[PDB]
Design a protein around this ligand. Sequence first.
Ligand SMILES: C[C@@H]1N[C@@H](C(=O)NCc2ccccc2)[C@H](O)[C@@H]1O
Length: 439
Amino acid sequence: EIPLKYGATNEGKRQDPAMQKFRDNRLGAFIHWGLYAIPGGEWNGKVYGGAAEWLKSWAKVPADEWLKLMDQWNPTKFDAKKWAKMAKEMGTKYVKITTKHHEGFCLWPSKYTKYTVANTPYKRDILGELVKAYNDEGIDVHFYFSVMDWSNPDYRYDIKSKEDSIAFSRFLEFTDNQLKELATRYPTVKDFWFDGTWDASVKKNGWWTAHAEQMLKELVPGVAINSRLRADDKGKRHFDSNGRLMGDYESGYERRLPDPVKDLKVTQWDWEACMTIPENQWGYHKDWSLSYVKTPIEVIDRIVHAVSMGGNMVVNFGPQADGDFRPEEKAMATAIGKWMNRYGKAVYACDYAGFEKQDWGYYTRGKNDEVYMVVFNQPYSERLIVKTPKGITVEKATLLTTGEDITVVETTRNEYNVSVPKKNPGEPYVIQLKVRAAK
Ligand SMILES: C[C@@H]1N[C@@H](C(=O)NCc2ccccc2)[C@H](O)[C@@H]1O
């Protein structure tokens, strides 16, 4: 046991209703919108293959020149009600929005910097319009916030002098003032998801990360705070020096989800994965031919994968500079929503089932002991193997969409073959099991 002042304070999952709602939501969308949407990955004739929201860095653009993109910020097609309607039809229960990315441009009219939506041709409080519209559709709103800020000359990557230390203190005050402003201007916010906290400067200031968590929890009752914010006394991030999770949930698994056989430890804590549609573009990039672009079934597979291991999934969108979405993202949201309208009972408010993983797909467990078989890989055998834990039996199988009874055959003393449906559903599909626990 290493003694810590700024380590974990939660042991185990929060079970207050706000945390139950964050968890039960399960499926979210992410919005990455900022000045990077204007150049869209291209600067002075060169299209850079790196993440569009990092173009300032790829193209070595000075801060003042980058921020002059504000003069072009005029998203005339923006309509927050239409964004909320898109999110509703996708089946999302919450939306996570970039309030300020590394570039430092604020989507709300901050009084602590000039680099905001207020000082653009458009003028309007984009964030505030989104909060109202998503909340009107019954959708929770979460705030992404980058601590690292390329627009503020008090930022430091490391602290190598007294002068650095003084500047960085003033930077942390600024950061607090913005955070307090977000929490008070938009009191319906349900989560802060911090990014840009990896630098040595932040790791040396673990105390500040703990302070930020506490300060926001005091201002917003029941707010969730991600693990990525947090560093302990020794500069250990996400999990402290004693291996305990900091914040309210683990944020991670951006590229790759936990392995369903080897990473069952994640079932012990809340966690949320966030995913891009292309391989690694969060902001709007004009050229999606540069990397692999996931199909709707590949996204759906990741959504159900997360839920099956006790986690949430958030699907990222990078809106165009004009305030509309690209055709690939409209098609994705529509396809997800059509599947979720059919099969969403196996997703919303579901969790890890405690069954051995099988090849056909994933199990999820509902709030009243329903066990759902979500089938992505259809066996040529026409038999879906189900190995039950000790003491558990399968009493019935039903096709979710139609209520058709599905034959269940015992093959050995804890294993069944569940038949595939009489007609191939032609898409990933759900069979609902009724199970019984002995003694
Ligand atoms: C959710 C994603 N997090 C952001 C990011 O900048 N990651 C890059 C990064 C992560 C760790 C060290 C250096 C760079 C991406 O730009 C998205 O906002």
